[PDB]
Ligand binder design. Structure first.
Ligand SMILES: COC(=O)c1c(C)cc(Oc2cc(C)cc(O)c2O)cc1O
Ligand SMILES: COC(=O)c1c(C)cc(Oc2cc(C)cc(O)c2O)cc1O
Ligand SMILES: [Zn+2]
Ligand SMILES: [Zn+2]
Lengths: 180, 176
């Protein structure tokens, strides 16, 4: 009888992995896109609370939306010229593309779905920090909403907070994950 | 109407010094079948599986993939873990055991109501050669690069239906 799923063994998982085709050698994971209801709240949260930098604001009037690219970069590295700024922004690794469909911030019946309740899909973005505890102590002092405090529940030492739209953000210390 | 630049810039605070070494480490997506997903992300897109973590008590596995050289991955478990979790731009694929055997199950990609997450995106040197190879490998498309007014920008889908943007940073300015 078909065994109940126990997931994959490490051997089977790596057995399904192919080495990269030479044609993909320069590919890079550039962005994760999330739709946001109110850029005023989101920009304040990602820059003031999390410390990211707004790289570029792109407006598409014909389509009634704007894109806000945030990333952990030094503001002084951002080229000034719009064309120069654009090519740099899109070649940075690990950016967050926040999509603002005009008008949602004034529509009291509108809200986006964070992927963690029916129907599920996307789960969270995650930020590596040197100390989850001191980072979360500061988030508490700043009124950040928590999904999981570091010492609460499962996986102690790991925390989850949420942004203005309710998207979950994992806060982790890379050097302590191994000891759960 | 949208925000004026002034309004948006005024909502941006300079980074607090305590956040100086923070990094955006991962994006997590739930996946139905790890065999299909791992084949897709490694053989088609060229990412490398850095590490796999299992949690039997909760019946799920985590797969961490990134654009890294496999020869750089530390051999010892604890060193490997610290390394994986300190890489920027990794993709965490969560496999809740059993979904691969449920014909009535599929994850929601965020692009149909209720919307939220939209896509991850890969920067490449030539969107057209990349997509020609994707097409030849049987990859499904949401938007081919030459379709629509936003030319030279494509969206493909992974085995679960999640959207993946394929863009050329040097050619983006022409469609903004
Ligand atoms: C009750 O469930 C959880 O608390 C939980 C779940 C279900 C999953 C989880 O996944 C991860 C575990 C670890 C160790 C690292 C990650 O980046 C993760 O996304 C972490 C968690 O704390
Ligand atoms: C007509 O609709 C679209 O095709 C489209 C829309 C509506 C938005 C869109 O957003 C982006 C535009 C650009 C220039 C870069 C990105 O990473 C984007 O996510 C890209 C698109 O191709
Ligand atoms: Zn995008
Ligand atoms: Zn995670």
């Amino acid at each position: 009888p078909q065994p109940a799923s126990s997931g994959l063994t490490d051997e089977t998982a790596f057995s399904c992995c192919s080495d990269p085709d030479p044609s993909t050698k320069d590919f890079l994971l550039q962005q994760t896109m999330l739709r946001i209801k109110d850029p005023k709240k989101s920009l304040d949260f990602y820059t003031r609370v999390l410390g990211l930098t707004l790289l570029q604001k792109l407006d598409f009037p014909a389509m009634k939306f704007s894109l806000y690219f945030l990333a952990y970069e030094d503001k002084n590295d951002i080229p000034k010229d719009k064309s120069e700024k654009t090519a740099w922004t899109f070649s940075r690794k690990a950016t967050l593309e926040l999509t603002h469909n005009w008008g949602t911030e004034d529509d009291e019946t509108q809200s986006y779905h964070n992927g963690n309740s029916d129907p599920r899909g996307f789960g969270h973005i995650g930020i590596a920090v040197p100390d989850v505890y001191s980072a979360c102590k500061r988030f508490e002092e700043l009124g950040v909403k928590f999904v999981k405090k570091p010492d609460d529940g499962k996986m102690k030492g790991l925390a989850f907070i949420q942004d203005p739209d309710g998207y979950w953000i994992e806060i982790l210390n890379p050097n302590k994950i191994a000891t759960i």
